[PDB]
């Protein structure tokens, strides 16, 4: 079959390209170790997903035999544990390391890189037992040494280990290692390791709904600002979800919009869908109409269509429509992770209406407002308007003597003393950008 | 006239969606389709319309007869004469494609036109082919094909245009009116209202000018439009025979609102049963209502709702309801005061609007700067 | 039609006469500068994306 020969040729080409690339990342690691410049290791992490799957088990075994020519204890211990391949006559002699290069032991950076590559390979293989064992061995190998350069790849190593363990539903088991390793990173101040470790520690509670624990771990912990964009986006998403479930809404919405903007524009379709969905529910709960622009995006269309229906129903303020939409889409809502806040909406609907009325009018007779918001009582209207003022959604003082509902006054602080405070934040941020730019000029 | 009739297209829509307008236009459309043997479209036309009648055979017999005649003629010419390129053989089979478009379906016509394009060696004879293809695409309302064809014709080939672009302007405008993009392209692309070619796609010069005036009003309520439409030479000249359109435009301009509202009602009714009713039926009406209220509100600071209602005739309660909804929408700066039935015009002043624009522009630029800075310094 | 500067308050049946504050060029120049910097930011974005 010519198809089999073509596939074998393609696999051989991919393996050769991958060996060349692995040599390139090894050279990058050597340069970063020599010059204390982890920029190359950041590049390797950035391009790490691209090299997820281009080899085979036998190719990996031959590569490891050729590379770890040094009498490395890690390879010595790992080889017997690896399943012994069947006797094969075809064994290419791959000896890139000769003389000084061969004598020099292979760096733990390279060892971890190759190990995590095997992790990705047998991960797509879904080889959970060996994944876990290899992760544990990697954990011991990292713990033996205390070099910062290792953590650069070790962070994604932990990430992949956690992802493997999630399938096994062993989060309650991982938590111990996660907490301990976070403590160690904190005692060493490893920025990226800390970022990923905090992220996964939060993710555990999020899936297990230990929200009080999550609040503890978010408030008491400290997130360094120099973290990566992706980890920042994850942190913002999880924090936004926690706050939104926590009945605090303004900060949650602000943070969620900031994260969504920070999130990749074209990648992470599902994750972007989830973040948009949580932000949509939060906004609707906070009595603000969302942006209709999103609900037409092709990238996030069908995962939201139920939410488009929900937002239209809430705006129209039709109880029958809201009940029917819930009755039709409760299962999807549960699946998404928004049932609690939607149950909150199911009685908080009238807040959006009070906000819209108090924003469109400037003085409404209380009987008129009662007729507007279908309450059937001036007393009920008075209570509701007092509630609107209390919650801080409207800024009108109710005068229960002439049915007045007096809105705000004439020109506000936003033309008297507000613009200066507004400009101060902008100027601080711009100067900060400039200072970071100048201080990040160059090494040589 | 030329090309499958956009008039037939409008009749199709009528016997279509309009659920009360199926009385006599149905008869006209049926008896006009029966002539000329458009079996392909007639299939779906009968599927949507009344069950059937025993005429499909009595038409398609001779339809296939003429198809076979043309095919035999052009094929015999091609076989006899080995002439290639711009040969009478190509003329003939392009004529066959013309008949195929005129009577048969969309897929066959498109295949025929694609086949005949490859032989084109005349830029004009290819521009006209693209015009035909876009006409068919508009007839069948295929947005993707329309956009691809329009962009191709405009860009790849529009270099030696012997002032055929006027036609391309009109087709661009038809497209951008089908799309709800009524303002920028729809307004500017009616600068060529001096159209010597009473185009086929144009139902008539009267309909062209009516569309021009409607789109002009929607895109420019009174933003110094008078220099283009109110004083428009040819615009007025044609307008003199369109009393309804003259009433509507001059009512919005001269500030005679009691009649502007009736004009808008009639315009909405008329646009309902039109091939551009999907993107306007309520959007255009709402925008025009908003612009009328905004124009009246300007020049004033406090207006008693009695006065506003009277200017609009009467309907004080309706004025409150509409004003409330529109202000809530996020436009039409004003704040109602129910307890006294007075409105207030809280328009931001020059400095306020300038600063509220600078703050947001700066917000966008700073976010961009931060993202770039993060991208660098990996 | 901007024949003259003023405003009408139907509430009191009173016509108000005044002038429009002219000194505003600062913000217009600033907004133009902001747009120019937006174009330059797009350009630098392009340079960075083309070359890492």
């Amino acid at each position: 079959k010519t198809a089999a020969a073509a596939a074998e040729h393609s696999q051989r080409e991919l393996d050769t390209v991958t060996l060349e690339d692995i040599k390139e990342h090894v050279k990058q690691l050597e340069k970063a170790v020599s010059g204390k410049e982890p920029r190359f290791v950041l590049r390797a992490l950035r391009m790490l997903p691209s090299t997820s799957r281009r080899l085979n088990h036998y190719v990996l075994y031959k590569a490891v035999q050729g590379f770890f020519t040094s009498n490395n204890a890690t390879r010595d211990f790992l080889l017997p544990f690896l399943e012994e391949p069947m006797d094969t006559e075809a064994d290419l002699q791959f000896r890139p390391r000769t003389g000084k290069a061969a004598s020099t032991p292979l760096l733990p950076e390279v060892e971890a890189y190759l190990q995590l590559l095997v992790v990705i390979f047998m991960m797509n293989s879904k080889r959970y037992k060996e994944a876990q064992k290899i992760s544990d061995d990697l954990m011991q190998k990292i713990s033996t040494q205390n070099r910062r350069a290792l953590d650069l790849v070790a962070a994604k190593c932990y990430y992949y280990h956690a992802r493997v363990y999630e399938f096994l539903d062993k989060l309650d088991v991982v938590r111990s290692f996660l907490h301990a390793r976070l403590r160690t990173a904190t005692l060493r101040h490893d920025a990226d390791g800390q970022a990923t470790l905090l992220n996964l520690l939060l993710r555990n509670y999020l899936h297990y709904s230990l929200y009080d624990q999550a609040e503890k771990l978010v408030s008491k912990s400290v997130f360094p600002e120099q973290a990566n964009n992706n980890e920042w986006a994850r942190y913002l998403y999880y924090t936004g979800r926690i706050k939104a479930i926590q009945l605090e809404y303004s900060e949650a919405r602000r943070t969620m919009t900031n994260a969504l903007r920070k999130a990749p524009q074209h990648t992470a379709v599902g994750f972007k869908q989830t973040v948009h969905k949580l932000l949509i529910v939060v906004e609707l709960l906070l009595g603000e109409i969302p942006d209709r622009l999103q609900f037409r995006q092709p990238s996030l269309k069908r995962s939201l269509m139920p939410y488009f229906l929900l937002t239209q129903a809430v705006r129209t303020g039709n109880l029958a429509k809201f009940n029917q939409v819930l009755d039709q889409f409760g299962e999807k809502f549960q699946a998404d992770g928004t049932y609690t806040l939607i149950i909150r909406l199911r009685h908080n609907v009238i807040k959006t209406g009070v906000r819209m009325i108090s924003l469109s009018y400037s003085r409404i007779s209380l009987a008129d407002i009662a007729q507007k918001l279908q309450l059937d009582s001036p007393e009920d209207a008075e209570f509701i308007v007092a509630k609107a003022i209390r919650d801080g959604v409207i800024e009108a003082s109710i005068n229960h003597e002439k049915g007045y509902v007096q809105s705000k006054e004439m020109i506000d602080i936003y033309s008297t003393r507000e613009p200066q405070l507004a400009f101060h934040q902008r100027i601080s941020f711009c100067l900060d950008i400039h200072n970071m730019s100048v201080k990040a000029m160059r090494f040589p | 006239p030329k090309n499958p009739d956009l008039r037939i297209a409008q009749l199709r829509f009528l016997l279509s969606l309009p659920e009360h307008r199926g009385d006599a236009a149905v008869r006209d459309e049926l008896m006009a389709a029966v002539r000329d043997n458009n079996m392909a479209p007639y299939y779906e036309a009968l599927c949507k319309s009344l069950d059937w009648q025993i005429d499909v055979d009595l038409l398609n017999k001779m339809k296939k007869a003429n198809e076979d005649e043309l095919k035999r003629l052009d094929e015999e010419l091609e076989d006899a004469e080995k002439n290639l390129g711009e040969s009478e053989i190509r003329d003939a089979m392009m004529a066959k494609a013309e008949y195929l478009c005129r009577i048969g379906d969309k897929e066959g016509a498109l295949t025929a036109f694609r086949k005949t394009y490859d032989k084109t060696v005349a830029l004009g004879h290819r521009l006209d082919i693209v015009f035909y293809l876009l006409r068919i695409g508009l007839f069948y309302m295929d947005n993707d094909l329309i956009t691809r064809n329009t962009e191709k014709a405009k860009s790849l080939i529009e270099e030696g245009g012997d002032w055929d672009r006027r036609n391309r302007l009109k087709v661009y405008q038809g497209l951008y009116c089908v799309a709800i993009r009524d303002f920028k392209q729809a307004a500017e692309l009616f600068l060529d209202t001096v159209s010597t070619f009473t185009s086929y796609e144009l139902m008539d010069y009267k309909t062209f000018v009516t569309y021009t005036v409607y789109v002009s009003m929607i895109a420019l309520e009174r933003p110094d439009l008078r220099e283009k439409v109110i004083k428009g030479a040819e615009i007025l000249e044609v307008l003199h025979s369109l009393p309804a359109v003259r009433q509507y435009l001059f009512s919005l301009y001269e500030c005679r609102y009691s009649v502007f509202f009736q004009s808008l009602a009639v315009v909405e009714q008329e646009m309902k049963k039109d091939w551009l009713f999907a993107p306007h039926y309520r959007y255009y009406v709402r925008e025009m209502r908003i612009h009328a209220y905004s124009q009246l509100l300007e020049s004033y600071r406090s207006l008693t709702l009695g006065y506003m209602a009277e200017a609009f005739g009467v309907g004080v309660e309706f004025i409150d309801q509409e004003l409330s909804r529109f202000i809530a929408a996020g436009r039409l700066h004003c704040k109602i005061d129910k307890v006294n039935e007075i409105v207030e015009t809280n328009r931001p002043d020059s400095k306020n609007w300038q600063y509220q624009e600078t703050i947001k522009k700066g917000d966008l630029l700073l976010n961009r700067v931060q993202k770039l800075s993060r991208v660098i310094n990996m | 039609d901007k024949k003259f500067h003023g405003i009408l308050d139907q509430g009191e049946g009173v016509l108000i006469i005044f002038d429009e504050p002219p000194v505003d060029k600062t913000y217009e120049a600033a907004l133009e500068t902001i747009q120019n910097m937006s174009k330059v930011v797009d350009s630098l974005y392009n340079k960075a994306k083309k070359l890492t």
């Binding site: 400009f423 902008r426 100027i427 711009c430 100067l431 950008i433 400039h434 730019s437 100048v438 990040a440 000029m441 160059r442 090494f443 040589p444 | 600078t358 700066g362 630029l365 700073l366 700067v369 770039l372 800075s373 660098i376 310094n377 | 600033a30 500068t33 902001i34 910097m37 330059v40 930011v41 630098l44 340079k47 960075a48 070359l51």
Partner: peptide
């Protein structure tokens, strides 16, 4: 706003060019 924006953009461009030049030089050295 104006001064901070101008200086920020200028500094970003200067860093961009300096890093590009030094990276190309180091890559080409060996």
């Amino acid at each position: 706003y104006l001064a901070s924006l101008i200086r920020s953009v200028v500094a970003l461009h200067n860093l961009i060019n300096n890093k590009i030049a030094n990276r190309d030089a180091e890559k080409k050295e060996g």
